[PDB]
Design a protein around this ligand. Structure first.
Ligand code: ADP
Ligand code: ADP
Ligand code: ADP
Lengths: 508, 485, 483
């Protein structure tokens, strides 16, 4: 009776808060924390995961929405707008009776009709470079500046078309985003193979490695000593004075094992023996072995070594010795690059060059984070477009045609479910409206123009976010993902039903 | 203290102007008047809004006074005057804060006004008078959008017949004209088409016994404020009249039957209970003179008045139809109809068109309305300001910038965006050489002004601009108000 | 969003006064309750309690500006404030924020492409000490008025011109050492860093010095303990003096036994090292700080060229010169009555050296003192009418925000700003680029800058304009946050 009204008000408030974010031309919000550090972002997922919401059921909506749509690429803010509009439209009929179950039946029937419509509208144009360009641009211009997105589209699309050779979509490890703080943010490219965070204390050991062999195996040039005896150095410090010694024999054992490894699998000072340590190493043994042609470094994280297993090769055990070099692999180039003060090791052209890392040079922390999120979103969107193989006309093209199909589907359903279907259509109509409003033009001017021209066009058609003119998104380059639409519709219907079925609230 | 009173004055001006900012044009947004008695008032006229509302700030009171004067001087445009004054003061607010004296600002405003007066005449399109075709086009253009839409024929014919019946050739060629000396005869009865025009003055007062030669071939009217008595034991006025031998005498009081026969012997027709508001037009139409001193009496006391008098009785009313008098300067226009609920506004619009014709005689110029003239003068000022030097150039540009408020409001109160339309109008108007495009008021769509066919008299727009600028300088020249409250 | 705009506007206003050679300065009090007098706006901001996030990111933009150029930060602040207030009134008109952003971006690109069209660059080279000294006087004149600019330009530039080798320079090479006492006119320039030392037991001509770094500075039973402690201390100083050590550096205090033992080791016991000097010494002599007295290492042992005592400045000091570059290190010794003006003088020295650096990286110079600002404003506002569309409003507002620099420069210098602005703008049609404002005359009079020699870096102004536009754009595109 009134719990429904409370939920409606909370959902409308959340929708109104998230109104001015949809679309590339939409403005962006900024997040402030108690510490003082601020984040500047526009993506709905991070906004809902970071906002401090007052109303409880609004927090419910945000949490469940993020949880469900983590599976698909994005569309979070569009989903929130559609569910808010659904609730408002249902309220305009509930306020005069209209028991929520009938509205639920109408919603489910409209969902079925919209699913069939989307199935028969989806366009299966064969994949090429140009379509990937268009998808990357559409998915990137909605998270970062215009020209920055234009620069980043080429990098992301080239990386993704490189990845696509496996004929199966895989992600996470195979694409790595490195972060650094060069002033020139315009520098953004891709590096094949691996890029290591940093190296060790080596004065011009190998540099241009060219051909190399990778064994790693967490070398022990600074093998752990026996420092821990009882708490700390007590009056009985002879343990931490002498027992801490005699472990240099481990370091010399590793040195000699690498010695015959190098002059067994190489036979010359060339062909850099690439090894890594998970902790620091002593410069003495390090440069003594590097002067023999061994590429030894230190202080690397795990993710790089697991990537080395699949992209370079070689086992990795901290406690080890010389063993079968069968696991060892080869690298085309292990050249090291330094920008200003910190060293980057470019492990590229290696065996299985499928693994590729992405390079950005953001000036400060928040721009770096926004760039990382934008490139991740673009990668996910293009991967989904690869997987479905059938892109769909965006810019509100599918939504308006879906609304028209639902309206023409009104007499098909009996009972009072027609009211639910009509409300569902009017709610799905929100997306082009929000696009036009965020762009700056009048709401209903653009909406009426688009509907009127789509009446005779037959083909799908969107909105140009530069003049308000209707535009055929198919021929321009605006594209969305089939799976995104599927998951959005399904989750939207589910959450709308769940909220509408509530009757009363009590404490606990 | 100091400039603070100026800021308060201009704030009051801005907050009184924007109240009725949105109520001009063919699609004026309507307003509410809620008296503290529960009543509710339906009103569109901003002049009526300000007349009904009451305000305490003296500057707002002075602006009410100037609005009323402009209403009673030239006619319409009072809302435009108020809007222009408010916008000019609001834009001068920034310069007042700029720590510049009001003297330089008002000097810049004066120079801008001088420039505007010229550039208005530069762009005004010529018009012809008494040319029925496009005069009727003007009637369908501006004299419309009132309650005479279905009855425009009566208004047009009345105006065209009565334009040449109050003209005064005092110092030039019929350029002196008044809308009050005309005999408007607004009586209900019959059909509205019964209204006509006559060359003379009509009196609603008549003798109780018109069984006499009330009309003479050449009446010689002489005004007399004295009332005739039975006799001296005053009869002496009868012999005094007999000395000069007139035939018509006007008095403000009744005449007895014996006194009526005495005046019949005096060979004069006695007219009683006349009204001063009608006696003035009697004297104007007949050229009468009043004198009673016996020493000053001469041959000039009595002069020729009417030419063909007559009295009829229409609608059981004692009419008095003087026609074809000596001077066609105070003639008759008849106003009949079944009801008078709209005919008053009809005659108001008639006097509006009368001012239109009078100023057309003054200056046969029409300005392209609908924001076309405003944008033209703003463009002229902005292009002329490039050569101007010194600090005074900024007000000379801000007055032009603030003058574009009229098309802004026209576009605003029709649904269309007030930004894109204004930008399109300005951008295309500059490159256009002599186009003067004016936005349509109904659809809120750009259109060349000749095709739309709307225009205003040069004199009325000139007066509006002059009053707005003078109000701006007057309100900026106030340095303090403390004389009590 | 008007809250953010107003906050940034107040932030810009509170530092607008300090702009120009007539910087009418402020008081500085921090949490630990000092009292400084300073006119440098960059010095003002670093102790302002800025809480509004828009202010936080505008001062972040200012910090980015100073890290790339080194001056004009106050210009960035005032330009951003003008841009944001004009954007505020544009929003009040009814324009969308995105349209304003687009207009500002296109106006910024127009400004960058029009800037290099009025450059009157340097004369011949970084050499000719007098010529470049005349060049580098503008920034220091802005920091400190013309009372001492003529001495300051020679003092600062003469130090940076010591090592014009291979066309490479470093700002950190020219450090500043402060000596209290006589007036500023008694300032001097010297080679090699100058700082206080304690012991005078130093030989003038020395071989390769051995900089011993002190990371950690200093009945019968009483006699026994005293003897043991003295012997331990003597062993410690013997260990310090090992490996051919000849000199030491310490942040501690002298001891009579310690100084005597060091002197009879022919080693001076240098103490009283400032908390900043030791990192610079270590980085310039190619060594590191020795942990204690007993573990010194010759591998991490300091060597620059030699060590001796300089009497310049009416005091005894320590000097290290002739590094691996043999001329890279060159400090400047200053004299002053108090310390509250030492900060301003060293700030002016930095404002000279960084402008010299950007001159090295860009030998192109544009007229200053309101010349370039009004010229670019005129160019952009003339281009605005040509460009149709809705970006035109943002273009004129960008030009108006650009022309606000000479307005503030005139106003905070005493002269009425509007008169100066109007006269300058009217003159600029005929009195072209080189015209500029006159500081001396109270009447609003103008004067050509080419003869005045008041010029500012082309690259500096370029980067300042770019970063101000970026900051204004990134401020305009926010809506709100929980607060
Ligand atoms: N260039 C463009 N023109 C018109 N519409 C666009 C353009 N780029 C993206 N869109 C629209 O933006 C929508 C996605 O934006 P949004 O929902 O804000 O991002 P997210 O998917 O992260 O929630 C898509 O439905 C698409 O139609
Ligand atoms: N059809 C029309 N199209 C455009 N503008 C019109 C039209 N009719 C009237 N206007 C505008 O209305 C204004 C006159 O209104 P106004 O004189 O203020 O009325 P009042 O004085 O009775 O309040 C003119 O400036 C003219 O531009
Ligand atoms: N004598 C002068 N006359 C006119 N303008 C000057 C004079 N000296 C310096 N200026 C102006 O002062 C500005 C220097 O600003 P500055 O105070 O260095 O900024 P910041 O404090 O951020 O480094 C220059 O742009 C220059 O135009």
């Amino acid at each position: 009776q009134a719990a429904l009204a409370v939920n409606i008000s909370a959902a409308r408030g959340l929708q109104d808060v998230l109104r001015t974010n949809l679309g590339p031309k939409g403005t962006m919000k900024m997040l402030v924390s108690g510490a003082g550090d601020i984040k500047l972002t526009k993506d709905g997922n991070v906004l809902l995961h970071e906002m401090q919401i007052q109303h409880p059921t609004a927090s419910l909506i945000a949490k469940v929405a993020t949880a469900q749509d983590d599976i698909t690429g994005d569309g979070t803010t569009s989903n929130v707008l559609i569910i808010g509009e659904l609730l408002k439209q249902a309220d305009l009929y509930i306020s005069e009776g209209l028991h929520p179950r009938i509205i639920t039946e109408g919603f489910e029937a409209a969902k079925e009709k919209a699913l069939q419509f989307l199935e028969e509208v989806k366009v299966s144009r064969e994949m090429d470079r140009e379509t990937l360009i268009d998808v990357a641009r559409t998915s990137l211009r909605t998270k970062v500046h215009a020209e920055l997105a234009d620069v980043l589209t080429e990098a992301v699309v080239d990386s993704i078309l490189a990845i696509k050779k496996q004929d199966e979509p895989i992600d996470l490890f195979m694409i790595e985003i490195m972060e650094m703080k060069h002033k020139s943010e315009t520098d953004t490219s891709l590096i094949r193979g691996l890029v290591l965070d940093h190296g060790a204390r080596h004065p011009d050991m190998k540099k241009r490695v060219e051909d190399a062999y990778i064994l790693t195996c967490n070398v022990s040039l600074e093998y752990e000593k026996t420092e821990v005896n009882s708490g700390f150095f007590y009056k009985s410090a002879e343990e931490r004075e002498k027992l801490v010694k005699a472990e240099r024999k481990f370091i010399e054992d590793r040195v000699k094992k690498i010695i015959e490894l190098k002059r067994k699998v190489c036979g010359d000072s060339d062909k850099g023996f690439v090894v890594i340590n998970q902790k620091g190493i002593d410069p003495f043994s390090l440069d003594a072995l590097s002067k023999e042609g061994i590429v030894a470094l230190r202080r690397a994280k795990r993710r790089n070594m697991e990537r080395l297993t699949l992209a370079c090769g070689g086992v990795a055990l901290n406690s080890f010795d010389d063993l079968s070099p069968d696991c060892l692999g080869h690298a085309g180039l292990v050249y090291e690059y330094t920008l200003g003060e910190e060293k980057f090791t470019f492990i590229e052209k290696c065996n299985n060059p499928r693994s590729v890392t992405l390079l950005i040079k953001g000036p400060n922390k928040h721009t770096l984070t926004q760039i990382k999120d934008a490139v991740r979103d673009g990668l996910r969107a293009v991967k989904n477009a690869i997987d479905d193989g059938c892109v769909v006309p965006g810019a509100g093209a599918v939504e308006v045609a879906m609304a028209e199909a639902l309206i023409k589907h009104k007499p098909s359903v009996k009972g009072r479910a027609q009211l639910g279907v009509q409300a569902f259509a009017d709610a799905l109509l929100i997306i082009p409206k929000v696009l036009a409003q965020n762009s700056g033009f009048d709401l209903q001017e653009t909406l009426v123009k688009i509907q009127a021209e789509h009446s005779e066009s037959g083909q799908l058609v969107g909105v140009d976010l530069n003049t308000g003119e209707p535009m055929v998104a198919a021929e321009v380059g605006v594209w969305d993902n089939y799976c995104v639409k599927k998951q959005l519709l399904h989750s939207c219907t589910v959450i709308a039903t769940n909220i509408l079925l509530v009757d009363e609230i009590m404490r606990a | 203290s100091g400039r603070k009173v100026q800021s308060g004055n201009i704030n009051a001006a801005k907050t009184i102007a924007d109240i009725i900012r949105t109520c001009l044009g063919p699609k004026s947004m309507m307003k509410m008047l809620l008296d503290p008695m529960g009543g509710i008032v339906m009103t569109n006229d901003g002049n009526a809004i300000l007349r009904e509302i009451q305000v305490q700030h003296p500057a707002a009171k002075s602006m009410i006074e100037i609005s009323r004067t402009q209403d009673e001087e030239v006619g319409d445009g009072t809302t435009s005057v108020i809007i222009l004054a408010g916008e000019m003061l609001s834009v001068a607010e920034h310069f007042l804060e700029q720590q510049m004296h009001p003297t330089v600002v008002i000097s810049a405003y004066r120079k801008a006004l001088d420039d505007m007066i010229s550039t208005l005449k530069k762009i005004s399109i010529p018009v012809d008078i008494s040319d029925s075709d496009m005069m009727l086009n003007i009637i369908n253009s501006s004299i419309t959008t009132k309650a005479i839409s279905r009855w425009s024929s009566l208004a047009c014919n009345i105006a065209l017949d009565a334009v040449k019946m109050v003209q005064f050739e005092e110092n030039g060629r019929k350029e002196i004209d008044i809308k009050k000396y005309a005999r408007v005869e607004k009586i209900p009865g019959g059909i509205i088409e019964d209204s006509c025009v006559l060359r003379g003055v009509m009196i609603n007062k008549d003798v109780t016994h018109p069984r006499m030669r009330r009309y003479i071939k050449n009446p010689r009217i002489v005004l007399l404020d004295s009332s005739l008595e039975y006799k001296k034991g005053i009869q002496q006025l009868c012999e005094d009249i007999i000395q000069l031998k007139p035939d018509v005498v006007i008095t403000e009081k009744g005449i007895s039957d014996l006194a009526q026969h005495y005046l019949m012997r005096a060979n004069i027709t006695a007219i009683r209970r006349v009204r001063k508001t009608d006696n003035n037009r009697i004297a104007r139409a007949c050229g009468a003179r009043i004198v009673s001193r016996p020493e000053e009496l001469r041959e000039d006391d009595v002069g020729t008045g009417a030419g063909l008098l007559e009295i009829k009785k229409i609608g059981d009313e004692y009419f008095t139809f003087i026609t074809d008098c000596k001077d066609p300067k105070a003639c008759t226009i008849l106003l009949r109809g079944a009801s008078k609920e709209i005919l008053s506004e009809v005659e108001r619009n008639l006097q509006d068109a009368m001012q239109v014709c009078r100023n057309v005689l003054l200056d046969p110029q029409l300005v392209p309305g609908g924001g076309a003239s405003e944008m033209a003068v703003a463009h002229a000022l902005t292009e002329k300001s490039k050569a101007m030097t010194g600090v005074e150039q900024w007000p000379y540009r801000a007055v032009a910038q603030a003058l574009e408020v009229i098309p802004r409001t026209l576009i605003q109160n029709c649904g269309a965006s007030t930004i894109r339309l204004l930008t399109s109008l300005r951008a295309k108007h500059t490159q256009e050489n002599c186009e003067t495009w004016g936005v349509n008021g109904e659809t809120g769509t750009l259109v060349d002004m000749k095709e739309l066919g709307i225009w205003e008299p040069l004199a009325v727009k000139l007066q509006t601009y002059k009053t707005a600028v003078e109000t701006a300088v007057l309100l900026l020249r106030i340095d303090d108000i403390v004389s009590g409250h | 969003v008007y809250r953010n705009i107003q906050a940034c506007k107040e932030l810009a206003q509170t530092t607008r006064t300090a702009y120009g050679p007539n910087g009418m300065n402020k008081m500085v009090i921090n949490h630990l309750e000092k009292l400084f007098v300073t006119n440098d706006a960059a010095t003002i901001l670093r102790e302002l309690e800025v809480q509004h996030p828009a202010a936080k990111m505008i001062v972040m933009a200012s910090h980015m500006q100073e890290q790339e150029v080194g001056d004009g930060t106050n210009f960035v602040l005032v330009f951003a404030g003008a841009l944001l207030e004009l954007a505020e009134e544009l929003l009040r008109i009814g324009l969308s924020v995105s349209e304003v952003i687009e207009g500002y971006e296109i106006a910024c690109r127009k400004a960058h492409e029009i800037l290099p069209n009025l450059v009157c660059c340097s004369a011949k080279n970084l050499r000719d000490i007098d010529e470049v000294s005349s060049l580098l006087r503008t920034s220091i004149m802005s920091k400190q008025y013309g009372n001492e600019v003529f001495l300051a330009k020679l003092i600062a530039q003469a130090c940076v011109s010591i090592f014009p080798d291979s066309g490479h320079f470093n700002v950190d090479n020219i450090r500043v050492c402060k000596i209290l006492g006589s007036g500023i006119s008694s300032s001097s320039v010297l080679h090699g860093m100058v700082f206080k030392k304690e012991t005078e037991g130093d030989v003038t001509s020395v071989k390769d010095a051995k900089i011993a770094v002190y990371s950690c500075p200093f009945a019968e039973e009483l006699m026994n303990f005293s003897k043991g402690e003295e012997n331990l201390m003597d062993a410690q100083v013997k260990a310090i003096a090992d490996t051919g050590a000849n000199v030491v550096v310490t942040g501690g205090k002298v001891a009579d036994m310690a100084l005597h033992y060091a002197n009879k080791y022919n080693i001076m016991l240098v103490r009283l090292n400032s908390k900043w000097d030791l990192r610079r010494l270590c980085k310039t002599v190619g060594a590191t700080a020795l942990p204690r007295l007993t573990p010194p290492v010759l591998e991490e042992m300091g060597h620059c060229d030699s060590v001796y005592l300089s009497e310049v400045g009416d005091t005894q000091v320590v000097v290290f010169k002739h590094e691996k570059e043999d001329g890279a290190i060159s400090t400047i010794v200053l004299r002053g009555s108090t310390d509250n003006l030492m900060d301003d003088i060293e700030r002016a020295v930095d404002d000279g050296v960084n402008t010299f650096k950007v001159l090295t990286r860009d030998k192109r110079l544009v007229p200053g003192g309101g010349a370039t600002e009004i010229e670019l404003a005129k160019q952009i506002t003339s281009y605005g009418e040509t460009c149709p569309g809705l970006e035109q409003y943002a273009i004129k507002k960008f030009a108006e925000a650009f022309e606000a620099i000479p307005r503030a420069l005139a106003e905070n210098s005493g002269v009425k700003a509007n008169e100066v602005i109007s006269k300058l703008y009217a003159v600029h049609q005929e009195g072209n680029k080189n015209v500029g404002l006159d500081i001396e005359a109270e009447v609003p009079a103008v004067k050509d800058m080419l003869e005045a020699g008041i010029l500012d870096t082309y690259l500096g102004k370029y980067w300042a304009i770019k970063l101000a536009t970026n900051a204004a754009v990134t401020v305009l595109r926010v809506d709100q946050i929980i607060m």
